[PDB]
Design goal:
2 copies of one chain form a homodimer. Chain A is of the alpha+beta class. The first copy, chain A, has 3 domains: about 1-15 and about 100-195, Beta Barrel (Thrombin, subunit H); about 15-100, Trypsin-like serine proteases (Thrombin, subunit H), CATH 2.40.10.10; about 200-300, main proteinase (3clpro) structure, domain 3, CATH 1.10.1840. The first copy, chain A, contains 8 helices and 13 strands. In chain A, β2 and β3 (about 35-40) form a beta hairpin. The longest helix of chain A has 14 residues, at about 260-275. The first copy, chain A, is elongated and about 70 Å long. Chains A and B meet through α1, β9 and β10 of A and α1 and β10 of B. The complex binds the ligand Cn1ccc(CNC[C@@]2(C(=O)Nc3cncc4ccccc34)CCOc3ccc(Cl)cc32)n1 (2 copies). One ligand QMX binds near residues 25, 44, 145 and 188 of chain A. One copy of the ligand Cn1ccc(CNC[C@@]2(C(=O)Nc3cncc4ccccc34)CCOc3ccc(Cl)cc32)n1 binds near residues 141, 166 and 189 of chain B. The PDB classes it as viral protein. Keywords: Diamond Light Source, I04-1, COVID Moonshot, CMD, fragment screening, PanDDA, XChemExplorer, viral protein. The assembly is dimeric. Group deposition SARS-CoV-2 main protease in complex with inhibitors from the COVID Moonshot -- Crystal Structure of SARS-CoV-2 main protease in complex with EDJ-MED-8c98ee63-2 (Mpro-P0224).
Amino acid sequence: SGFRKMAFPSGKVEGCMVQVTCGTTTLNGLWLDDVVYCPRHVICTSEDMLNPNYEDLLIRKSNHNFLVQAGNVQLRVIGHSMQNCVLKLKVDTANPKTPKYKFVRIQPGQTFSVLACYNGSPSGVYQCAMRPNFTIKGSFLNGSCGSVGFNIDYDCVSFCYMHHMELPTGVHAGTDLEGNFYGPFVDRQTAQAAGTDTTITVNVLAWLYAAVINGDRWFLNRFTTTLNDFNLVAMKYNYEPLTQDHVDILGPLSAQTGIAVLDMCASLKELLQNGMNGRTILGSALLEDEFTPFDVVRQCSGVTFQ
Amino acid sequence: SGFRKMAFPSGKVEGCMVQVTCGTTTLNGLWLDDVVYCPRHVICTSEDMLNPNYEDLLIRKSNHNFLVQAGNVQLRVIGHSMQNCVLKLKVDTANPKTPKYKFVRIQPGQTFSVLACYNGSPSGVYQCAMRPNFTIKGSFLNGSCGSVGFNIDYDCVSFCYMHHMELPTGVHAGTDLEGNFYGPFVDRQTAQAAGTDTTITVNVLAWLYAAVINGDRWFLNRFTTTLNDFNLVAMKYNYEPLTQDHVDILGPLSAQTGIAVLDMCASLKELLQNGMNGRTILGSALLEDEFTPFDVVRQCSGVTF
Ligand SMILES: Cn1ccc(CNC[C@@]2(C(=O)Nc3cncc4ccccc34)CCOc3ccc(Cl)cc32)n1
Ligand SMILES: Cn1ccc(CNC[C@@]2(C(=O)Nc3cncc4ccccc34)CCOc3ccc(Cl)cc32)n1
């Protein structure tokens, strides 16, 4: 019992964090096998940040310009290439702590753990979600660039995010491990703004099923709704539309609790109308949207608390 | 920018997690040097848990009865002893991944990271606080016993908690690494209940300073209060008393934000009597009490491990 915002154990990722210095810029790199991945803006000179020509800046660099530090050992860079917004530094030593890994690009609503690093050293781990506006609400100070997001499902690390920038609202933008940004963002200091964010509806529903599995039923009601009527209400509270994919994904939780998805949808509509009235759901006075249906099944038991 | 509930990196602790099986019971153990620490209730069965004489149950056990598994390698138990509610299994091999460590007992209000494990395998890490009623609001399923709580100070892991049980309200109870329970709990199948909990006041204030550092100032007001007047109000809302040591601990955050501790206390007092009025602080409609003053400084300054 109990429901917490839980991150994956970060050990497999800690053994990959290195410091990458290029001139006056220092940030984090991900050392996997004989390659160090990091944001390509490590080659920028702050002035360059507005309209950098990364191909032009990279061509002027030599291997010895990149100082890579793994603990108290300096790695030797023997090659460098750029793939989208990520810089790939070939090093002369394979990381002996390289775990089984994959590079996965995630969709909005997906959650992952972030290992926040400064100077190649891990300082904290937290759980986050890719917002529908493609930003993450992280906790990142200057020097955190190159910090990664990941999931650890069954001994394999799926790297899904690398931190690159903070937008003016305090939210964060980054890329997958192939250098493609999530969202309409660019690694330039040009005026950029996060679009209006919305609540991840399928995740809220998954968290309402977690609350039911944990013995909380106060918010349930005798009503059902159509998928279209639910979406018409949801859009008015800046909630993402719920698709038939989402309804299908919620199927296992619906079967385990005995509450049809559209029944839980009607309970959500009522919560949006009434608020909580001084009550909490899983220790929260707001509807939580950073737990996917997969996270709820993973964390919760296979026996509901009737 | 940003403020998250953040746990310490768990790598140093993951390299210590092992599986301990005794009869039909399987749980987690902490392998440090040549000793494996685990809850002593691993020696119990269905009848034994009801009224256990752990000295009597342990004397009947031999070293080969304890199956310890570190990854896919079985460790050989060469000795066993009990210290309070923790079982210490001496093994033939020192854990080569043993970090620099200490066993520390924490006080209510102090926070720590929990590495939740099942079958000696880490599955999640979360941040939690020792509640004033000595329970933790954790997330544990059957098989999580032996999962540990820790903090990191520099390169040293301070182990402060080992999970033993779940109370009927869904909250959790455990011991320090010397086997002394936090709270008036016992490791037996018997009627036990968590006492009425209270809010950790110094931690709420620390989280209000984190909100100010992050640009959330709506709750600030021109007022200040005495420590005596604030404590009268705090007691009325089931908030822990704020001491002069708490005021001193909040000093650095008071200096950085320009809001004196009793100035932030008047702001907390108004929040208690009037609520948030549909507003949020750091994305929360409730006052968060699981960030200590040290956690706030650590996260709003970037200390690494
Ligand atoms: C010269 N240089 C190289 C690396 C850096 C490091 N700054 C890069 C920068 C950025 O967003 N950095 C930060 C990232 N995350 C949290 C932060 C918290 C506080 C301050 C800065 C943060 C700032 C300038 O605006 C941009 C535009 C685009 C991009 Cl991709 C990156 C940035 N500076
Ligand atoms: C010997 N053994 C077999 C299985 C177990 C493990 N159960 C020990 C037990 C306990 O509290 N276990 C649990 C701990 N955390 C989360 C849980 C979620 C679901 C079910 C059980 C959980 C059972 C109840 O009664 C008590 C009394 C006292 C003590 Cl110290 C321990 C326990 N131990």
